[PDB]
RNA sequence: AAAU
């Protein structure tokens, strides 16, 4: 199947959606205000702690009204994150922050809050420093070619509109969608993005026993994708066509780390151990399949939505608006 | 089953 030959009639509609999702500078100032407020609070409780922003508010892919993610980093070998987060939830409530919720039995313990002063909502985790590093990797990829943020914005907005963007309900995180978008652009001919982890590296850090190494001098690559002249509507059609009809769900793994497709058997992801129904390898924690949140029920919904998206992109006379229509049972 |  070849891309529809009228595809460029729809580029402008997708650019307009992308531009509509860029956060307002006023919202970014409110993020900084809440971060400084939280830094002050934590400094009285744990003066030796340090706070780091990560996730959508720091990786270039944030939407308007996106929560800020904060990593509370603290040294020690006997750190009990649940006891810390329960103490922090009480400190947050006593400072008059709202909707403070501590989930200390989840896989990654977390406390959530909403600030009525800045209107910004926030989630805090303890010592998940790896997330700060993969945030930098995504931020560095985003500097290489504007089409990455454009495609990722359309895909993330689509996933929210079609209700397939919540790991608690068995669908995919925004971080997973951004990795899928990076991998798709790595595989274009010619490629729109390089494989930074395969290049001669300029950056390397170790967190826990995991070394994170890649070429991060991305200012040298600002025109890397210039040999590829594909437009945004072409890439949106191609992305959903891949996941709808080309991806081998039973056997294949998409790997931003290598810019290639790996085998499930080669990854030892052949059966649930951690389900492995739509395999997306984390670039640094390579034992982590980001699709493991998807189960034997939600995989059917995801694939059905991929097929709907691909067919809309190929055949609908107004594909941008139709693609993003909400699902109404 | 809840972070990135």
Our measurement of the distance from residue A73's CA atom to the centroid of its chain's CA atoms, rounded to an integer in Å, reads 21
Write down which residues 80-109 in A have CB closer than 7 A to strand B.
103, 105-108
Can you give the distance from the CA of residue A16 to the C1' of nucleotide B2 in angstroms? Answer: 32
Q: Count other Cβ atoms within 10 Å, centred on residue A119.
A: 12
Residue A167 CB lies within 7 Å of the nucleic strand B: yes
- Compute the distance between CA of residue A278 and CA of residue A296 in angstroms, rounded to an integer: 10
User: By residue range, what is the domain housing residue A226?
Assistant: 1-329
Q: Which nucleotide is nearest to A61 (CA to C1')?
A: B4
This structure's resolution (Å) is 1.8
Domain count, chain A: 1
Q: Closest residue by Cα to the C1' atom of nucleotide B2?
A: A168
Residue A92 carries which DSSP code?
A: H
Q: Closest residue by Cα to the C1' atom of nucleotide B4?
A: A131
Contacts with A269 (C-beta within 8 Å, 6 or more apart), sequence order:
A253, A276, A279, A289
Per the rule left: phi > 0, alpha: psi between -120 and 50, beta: everything else, A71 is beta
Annotated binding site of A for UTP: 56, 131-135, 156, 160, 174-175, 282, 288
- Compute the distance between CA of residue A140 and CA of residue A162 in angstroms, rounded to an integer: 29
β-bridge mates for residue A51, sequence order? A72
**Contact of A15 with A53, CB cutoff 8 Å:** no
- Alpha-helix runs per DSSP H in chain A: 11-20, 25-45, 81-94, 129-142, 146-161, 174-186, 232-241, 264-267, 298-315, 319-323
**Contact of A195 with A213, CB cutoff 8 Å:** no
Residue A127 CB lies within 7 Å of the nucleic strand B: no
What is the experimental method? X-ray
DSSP strand E in A175-274: where?
203-207, 210-214, 252-255, 260-263
Which tokens belong to A323?
């693609």
Q: Closest residue by Cα to the C1' atom of nucleotide B1?
A: A168
Give helix A174-186 / helix A232-241 axis angle, nearest 10°.
Answer: 110
């Amino acid at each position: 199947m070849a891309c529809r030959n009228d595809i460029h009639r729809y580029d402008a509609t997708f650019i307009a959606i992308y531009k509509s999702l860029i956060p307002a500078e006023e919202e970014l100032e409110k993020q900084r205000q809440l971060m400084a407020h939280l830094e002050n609070l934590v400094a009285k409780e744990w003066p030796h702690a340090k706070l780091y922003l990560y996730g959508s508010c720091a990786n270039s892919f944030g939407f308007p009204k996106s929560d800020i993610d904060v990593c509370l980093a603290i040294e020690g070998d006997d750190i009990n994150k649940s006891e810390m987060l329960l103490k922090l939830a009480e400190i947050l409530e006593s400072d008059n922050l709202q909707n403070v919720q501590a989930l200390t039995r989840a896989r990654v313990p977390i406390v959530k809050l909403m600030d009525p002063v800045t209107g910004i909502s926030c989630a805090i985790c303890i010592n998940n420093v790896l997330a700060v590093v993969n945030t930098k990797l995504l931020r560095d990829y985003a500097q290489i070619d504007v089409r990455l943020r454009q495609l990722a914005f359309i895909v993330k907005h689509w996933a929210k509109s079609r209700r397939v963007n919540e790991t608690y309900q068995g669908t995919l995180s925004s971080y997973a969608y951004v990795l899928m978008c990076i991998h798709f652009l790595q595989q274009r001919r010619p490629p729109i993005l390089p494989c930074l982890q395969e290049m001669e590296p300029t950056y390397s850090v170790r967190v826990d026993n995991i070394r994170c190494t890649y070429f991060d001098n991305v200012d040298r690559l600002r025109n890397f994708g210039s040999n590829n002249r594909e437009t945004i509507a072409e890439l949106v059609w191609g992305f959903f066509n891949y996941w709808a009809y080309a991806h081998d769900y039973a056997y294949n793994v998409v790997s931003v780390r290598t810019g290639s497709i790996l085998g499930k058997r080669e990854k030892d992801w052949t059966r649930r151990v951690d389900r492995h129904l739509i395999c997306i390898e984390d670039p640094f924690e390579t034992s982590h399949d980001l699709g493991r949140v998807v189960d034997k029920f939600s995989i059917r919904v995801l694939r059905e939505e991929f097929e709907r998206a691909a067919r809309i992109m190929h055949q609908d006379p107004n594909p941008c608006a139709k693609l993003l229509e909400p699902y109404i049972p």
